[PDB]
Amino acid sequence: PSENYTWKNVRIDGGGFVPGIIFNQKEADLIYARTDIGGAYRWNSATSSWIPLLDWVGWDNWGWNGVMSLATDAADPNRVYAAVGMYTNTWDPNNGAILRSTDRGNTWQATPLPFKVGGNMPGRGMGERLAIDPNRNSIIYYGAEGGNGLWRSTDYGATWAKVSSFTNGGNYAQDPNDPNDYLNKIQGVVWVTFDPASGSAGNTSQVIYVGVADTQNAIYRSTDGGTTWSRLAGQPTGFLPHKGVYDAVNGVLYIAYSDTGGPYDGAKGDVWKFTASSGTWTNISPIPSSSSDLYFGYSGLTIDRKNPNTLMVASQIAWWPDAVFFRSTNGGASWTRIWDWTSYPSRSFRYTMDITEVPWLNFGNSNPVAPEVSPKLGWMNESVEIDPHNSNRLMYGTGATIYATENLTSWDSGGQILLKPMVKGLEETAVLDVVSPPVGAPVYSALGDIGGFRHDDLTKVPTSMYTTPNFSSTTSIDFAELQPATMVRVGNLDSGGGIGVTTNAGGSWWQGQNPPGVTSGGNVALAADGGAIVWAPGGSTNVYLSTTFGSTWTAISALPAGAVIEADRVNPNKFYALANGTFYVSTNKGASFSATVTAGIPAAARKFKAVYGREGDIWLAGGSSTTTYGLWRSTNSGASFTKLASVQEADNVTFGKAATGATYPAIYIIGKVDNVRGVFRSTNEGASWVRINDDQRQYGNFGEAISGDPRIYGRLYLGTNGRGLLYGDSA
Numbered sequence: 001p002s003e004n005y006t007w008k009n010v011r012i013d014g015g016g017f018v019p020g021i022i023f024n025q026k027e028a029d030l031i032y033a034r035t036d037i038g039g040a041y042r043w044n045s046a047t048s049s050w051i052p053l054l055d056w057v058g059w060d061n062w063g064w065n066g067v068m069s070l071a072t073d074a075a076d077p078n079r080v081y082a083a084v085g086m087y088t089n090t091w092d093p094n095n096g097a098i099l100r101s102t103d104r105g106n107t108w109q110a111t112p113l114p115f116k117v118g119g120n121m122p123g124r125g126m127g128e129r130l131a132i133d134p135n136r137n138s139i140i141y142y143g144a145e146g147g148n149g150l151w152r153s154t155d156y157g158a159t160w161a162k163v164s165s166f167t168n169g170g171n172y173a174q175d176p177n178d179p180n181d182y183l184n185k186i187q188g189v190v191w192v193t194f195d196p197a198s199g200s201a202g203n204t205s206q207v208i209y210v211g212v213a214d215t216q217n218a219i220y221r222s223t224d225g226g227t228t229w230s231r232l233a234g235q236p237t238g239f240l241p242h243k244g245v246y247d248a249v250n251g252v253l254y255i256a257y258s259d260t261g262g263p264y265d266g267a268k269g270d271v272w273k274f275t276a277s278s279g280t281w282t283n284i285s286p287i288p289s290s291s292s293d294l295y296f297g298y299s300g301l302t303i304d305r306k307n308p309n310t311l312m313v314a315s316q317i318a319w320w321p322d323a324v325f326f327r328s329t330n331g332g333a334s335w336t337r338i339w340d341w342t343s344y345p346s347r348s349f350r351y352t353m354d355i356t357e358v359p360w361l362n363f364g365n366s367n368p369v370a371p372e373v374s375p376k377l378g379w380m381n382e383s384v385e386i387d388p389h390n391s392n393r394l395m396y397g398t399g400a401t402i403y404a405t406e407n408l409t410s411w412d413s414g415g416q417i418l419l420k421p422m423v424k425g426l427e428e429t430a431v432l433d434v435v436s437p438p439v440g441a442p443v444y445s446a447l448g449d450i451g452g453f454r455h456d457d458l459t460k461v462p463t464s465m466y467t468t469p470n471f472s473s474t475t476s477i478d479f480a481e482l483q484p485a486t487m488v489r490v491g492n493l494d495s496g497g498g499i500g501v502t503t504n505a506g507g508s509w510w511q512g513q514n515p516p517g518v519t520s521g522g523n524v525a526l527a528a529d530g531g532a533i534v535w536a537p538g539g540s541t542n543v544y545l546s547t548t549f550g551s552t553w554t555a556i557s558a559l560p561a562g563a564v565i566e567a568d569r570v571n572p573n574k575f576y577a578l579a580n581g582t583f584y585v586s587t588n589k590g591a592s593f594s595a596t597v598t599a600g601i602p603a604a605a606r607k608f609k610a611v612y613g614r615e616g617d618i619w620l621a622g623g624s625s626t627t628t629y630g631l632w633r634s635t636n637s638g639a640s641f642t643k644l645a646s647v648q649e650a651d652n653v654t655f656g657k658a659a660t661g662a663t664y665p666a667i668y669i670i671g672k673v674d675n676v677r678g679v680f681r682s683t684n685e686g687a688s689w690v691r692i693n694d695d696q697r698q699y700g701n702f703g704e705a706i707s708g709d710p711r712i713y714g715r716l717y718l719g720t721n722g723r724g725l726l727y728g729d730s731a
C-alpha cells in the first residue's frame, strides 16, 4: 500500500547554479527559475519562497530535471513551457521533451523530442532557447543542440517539428576533441527573440531574431514570420551570442557575446547594438574585445522595460577579484560599473550585500585577502534580469545562489544598491552522504560544492559549512555508533582530497594526514568505539587503516581501491567492504580483510549498511535491470546473505526507529516493490513494505544518500541529486 507522509526540504537555501531567471512580461511578481539538475521553480510572493514544479519527474525519466529553457507567456500568464533533458552524450539515455502547462506549472503535459536536450551540458547559460510569439501565442520556437537546428510548434507546444528553412544548426563545441565525450557537443541554436511590433494581436509576428553558436554566423533574422531566414548583414564575427534582447521602443537588438559557450569560462567578447530601421551595427561594449584590458566575455544582458534606455550586462567570466556588472542609462552610449579600482588592491563599490539569511555564502571566510571580498558578488552570472514591472528590482543567478536588489535605481542617483539572497525554497544541492546520530543534532549533510552542514534545526539555514578542513564537497561522513560525538568526514578540496576528524560532534574539527595518491574524498568508515578509521580515497591504489585517528595510515592488502567500506555498529572489531560482486569482512579492526561472498550478489551493487544495535546484521542493495537486482540481508557478519523475495529492485537501504511494539528498526529503501518504483518502509523486517512517497514526489535520480532517524519513528532523510536534502514524516 501507501501511507500519507509530509515531505519537506532540510533548510539550506540554494547551493547550486541557476542558469536562468525568467520574468513574465505582463504580470507583476510572476517569476520562474530554471536549474540544470533540479527542475524548475515558480516564485510565490505571498510566502517569499520558490515552489518546485518538476518533483514528479521520476526514476525512468530522471533527465527531465534538466531544464534547458523556460518560457512564460506574456499573452496568457497561465501558460508556461520548459525544454527538458539533462545530457546530450551517453549519460542521459533519454531524449529531451517540451513540457507545456496552462496552470503556471502546477500540472504539465509532455511532448518528447526526437533528440537530446542538454540541461546540464556546456552552453546551458545561453538562452532562452524557447520563445513564444507575443502576438500569436500558439506559436513557440525552440533552439536545439546537436545540429537539430531550430524547431517550432504552432499548437501551444503540443506538436513540434523542425523548421527546415533554418539551415544553420551551429558548429561550435567547447572542446571538439574531448576524449570524455562531455565538452564535444554542438551547442547549436541558442536563443530566439521576437520583435513585438512586427505583428498585432492574433497575428503572426513577422520579425524574429535567432542566435546561433557559430562564430562566423551568429545572428539570423526572418522578416516573413519564419518562412525564410537570413544571416544578418554586417554583423560582427569571432564570438558566440549568449543573449539577444530586443527593444521595440527604440527598435534595437542588443547582443552579448563571448568567446566560449560558458558557463565556467569566457576570456573575450563584445556587446553590440543592431538598429533595425537602418541596419546599423554599433559596438557598445563597456570594454571592447580589441582592448587588452578585457579579460572576459559578456552575458547577463537585460533591458529595463519600464525605462528602455537602461540596460545592464555582466562579465562572463571574471573570477578575480569578482564579477563585474555594468549599467548604462543611455542605450549603451556609456556605462558605469558596479565596482572600481581605487589604489590596488582597494576598490570602491556601488553595492552592499547582506547574507544574514544565508550566512554560509561567506564560504567559511568572511575576510579573504584584498582584493577579494566574501561574500563575493558572484560567478557564472549568466542570468541577470531587471524586473519588467519594477525598475528597482533585479535578480541574478550565480554558481551558488540567486541575489536580488529592490533598490536598483539608487545606482543612478550615486547611491549603493543592497543585494541579498532570494533562494528560500530553491533547494538545489546534490547530497552525497547523510547521517542521523542518536544524540545531538538531528542530521549532518555531506554535500556537493558547499561542503555540508550540521543541521541543528531543520527549518533554519546553518551558519557555516564544515571547516578546518573546509571541503568543496564532502563525499562521505560517519560517526562512532557507541560514541557519536566522534565523527569523520572525507572530501575534496583545492588540489585533491582530505579527512576531517572530531570528538565533539563537530564543535571543532581538525584535518588529518593523507595516505598516498589521494585525488578525491572517496568513502570512509569509523569503528563503533571510534578507535579505527578505514578510508578508501579517490585516486589512491589501496584502502587504508588509521589506528591513530587520522595521523598515520597503512595500506590494507586484500581490498580493491574504491571499495565501499562500512563499520559494524556494535563491534568495533568488525568492518566490511563491498566491491564489484565481492563482499569482504575484517574481524581485526580493519588490519586485514578476506572475501566472504563472491557470487550471488550483483556486481553493480554498491550500497550496504550495518544496523545499529545489531552486531553483524547487514543489508545490501543494488543491481541493474539487465543483470540481477534486489535487497539482501546478512545476519552473520557478512558470511552469507539472503535475497529478500519481497523486493524486486533496490538501490539503497537504511534504518530508523522501530514502530511501537515492533522488535526491529524500521527499514527504508529506494527501490521497486510489487511493480511500483518509489520509496518504501518496512516495519516487519522486510516481510512487507509501504510506499511513503507518491507520483508528485519522486525527485528523479534520488537516493544516493539516505538515513533513517534512530530517534523519530517514520522519519526518512532523503538525499537527492539537485533537490537538496528532504525529510519525510508519517502524517
Ligand SMILES: OC[C@H]1O[C@@H](O[C@H]2[C@@H](OC[C@H]3O[C@@H](O[C@H]4[C@H](O)[C@@H](O)[C@H](O[C@H]5[C@H](O)[C@@H](O)[C@H](O)O[C@@H]5CO)O[C@@H]4CO[C@H]4OC[C@@H](O)[C@H](O)[C@H]4O[C@@H]4O[C@H](CO)[C@H](O)[C@H](O)[C@H]4O)[C@H](O)[C@@H](O)[C@@H]3O[C@@H]3O[C@H](CO[C@H]4OC[C@@H](O)[C@H](O)[C@H]4O)[C@@H](O)[C@H](O)[C@H]3O)OC[C@@H](O)[C@@H]2O)[C@H](O)[C@@H](O)[C@H]1O
Binding pocket: 015, 016, 017, 264, 265, 266, 319, 320, 361, 362, 363, 368, 373, 374, 375, 376, 379, 398, 399, 400, 449, 450, 471, 472, 473
Ligand atoms: O566566496 C567564494 C569562495 O569560493 C571558494 O571556492 C568555492 C566556489 O568556487 C567557485 C568556483 O571556483 C572555481 O575555481 C576558480 C578559481 O576560484 C579561480 O581563481 C580561477 O581563476 C582563474 C581562471 O582559472 C583562469 O582561467 C583565468 O584566466 O584567471 C583566473 C584568475 O586567476 O578560476 C577557477 C575556475 O577555473 C577553471 O574554470 C574555467 C577555465 O577557464 C579554467 O581553465 C579552469 O581552471 C582550471 O581548473 C582545473 C580543475 O577544474 C585546475 O584547478 C587547473 O589548474 C585550472 O587552471 C572552481 O573551478 C569551480 O568548480 C567553482 O564553481 C563551482 O563548480 C561546481 C562544479 O564543479 C566541477 O566542474 C568544474 C571544475 O572546475 C571543478 O573542478 C569540478 O568539481 C558547480 O556545480 C558550482 O555551481 C560552482 O559554483 O564555490 C564552490 C566551492 O566548492 C568552492 O570551494 C574559494 O575557496 C574561496 O577562497 C572563495 O573564493
Ligand SMILES: OC[C@H]1O[C@@H](O[C@H]2[C@@H](OC[C@H]3O[C@@H](O[C@H]4[C@H](O)[C@@H](O)[C@H](O)O[C@@H]4CO)[C@H](O)[C@@H](O)[C@@H]3O[C@@H]3O[C@H](CO[C@H]4OC[C@@H](O)[C@H](O)[C@H]4O)[C@@H](O[C@@H]4O[C@H](CO)[C@@H](O)[C@H](O)[C@H]4O)[C@H](O)[C@H]3O)OC[C@@H](O)[C@@H]2O)[C@H](O)[C@@H](O)[C@H]1O
Binding pocket: 015, 016, 017, 036, 037, 062, 090, 091, 092, 120, 121, 180, 181, 182, 399, 429, 430, 448, 449, 701, 721, 722
Ligand atoms: O568528462 C566529464 C567531466 O565532468 C566535469 O564536471 C562537469 C559535469 O559534472 C557532471 C555532474 O554534474 C553534477 O551537477 C552539478 C551541476 O553541473 C552544476 O552546475 C551545479 O551547480 O552543481 C551540480 C552538483 O555538483 C551532478 O550532480 C552529477 O550527478 C553529474 O555527474 C554525472 O552524473 C551522470 C548521471 O549519473 C547520475 O544520474 C543518473 C544515475 O543513474 C547515476 O547513478 C548518477 O550518478 C553520470 O553519468 C552516468 O555515468 C555512469 C558511469 O560512467 C553510467 O553508468 C551511467 O549510465 C551515466 O548515467 C556521470 O558519470 C557523472 O559525471 O557536468 C556538469 C558540469 O557543471 C561539470 O563542470 C568534471 O569537472 C571533469 O573533471 C570530468 O569529470
Ligand SMILES: [Br-]
Binding pocket: 295, 317, 318, 319, 320
Ligand atoms: Br578572471
Ligand SMILES: [K+]
Binding pocket: 127, 128, 129, 130, 131, 191, 192, 193
Ligand atoms: K528568448
Ligand SMILES: [K+]
Binding pocket: 265, 266, 267, 295, 296, 297, 316, 317, 318, 319
Ligand atoms: K576570464
